[PDB]
Amino acid sequence: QSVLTQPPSVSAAPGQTVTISCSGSSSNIGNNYVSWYQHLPGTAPKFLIYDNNKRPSGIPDRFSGFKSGTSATLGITGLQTGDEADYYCGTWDSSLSALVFGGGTKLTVL
Amino acid sequence: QSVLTQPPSVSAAPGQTVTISCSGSSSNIGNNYVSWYQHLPGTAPKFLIYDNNKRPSGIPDRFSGFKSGTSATLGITGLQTGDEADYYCGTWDSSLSALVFGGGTKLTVL
Ligand SMILES: [Zn+2]
Ligand SMILES: [Zn+2]
Ligand SMILES: [Zn+2]
Secondary structure, three states: OOOEEOOOEEEEOOOOOEEEEEEOOHHHHHOOOOEEEEEOOOOOOEEEEEOOOEOOOOOOOOEEEEEEOOEEEEEEOOOOHHHOEEEEEEEEEOOOOEEEEEOOEEEEEO | OOOEEOOOEEEEOOOOOEEEEEEOOOOOOOOOOEEEEEEOOOOOOEEEEEOOOEOOOOOOOOEEEEEEOOEEEEEEOOOOHHHOEEEEEEEEEOOOOEEEEEOOEEEEEO
């Protein structure tokens, strides 16, 4: 199992909003900056959010992040078929002195 | 301790070449695609290499990857002051059925 907990899968239709939860502890998500990235087999992995809610240059505002307490969420509005991919949250764990990641959420566009 | 083993730090002067090694086992690097990303605290993390040796769109060719047997290496030619960051390797680990990552390499440009 993963140190950070994500749902294995999420699905919605084009144009709809999806959110992906990521649950942790005070040692990791509670006290530390959360990042998110996506990877679909065959294409490059790409970071979408960092420092909880900031977007790399080139990521559109359809993507956003919110962290409160020991949970972080990635929101995707205007869902596009090109958003199909595995999505992962990650953060530093102060107790383990190590980066930890969620186990991944497969996003299916219906 | 991290599943994949990287040197803790490397250092070189601007213009020089640096290589950063990443070592695993047949369960991970030996039979799975390796990716690399960089994170300089305060800036967006970014993927540099995936599927052993492919560059994401937007990454210039002075970054390269090589993987042979149970080890993988990242190369950076024409080192720039802007290349200061922490560099991580990652792969699928077939015995964990999970992604695993190296502990990170801090790169200082002297
Ligand atoms: Zn992946
Ligand atoms: Zn980082
Ligand atoms: Zn560091």
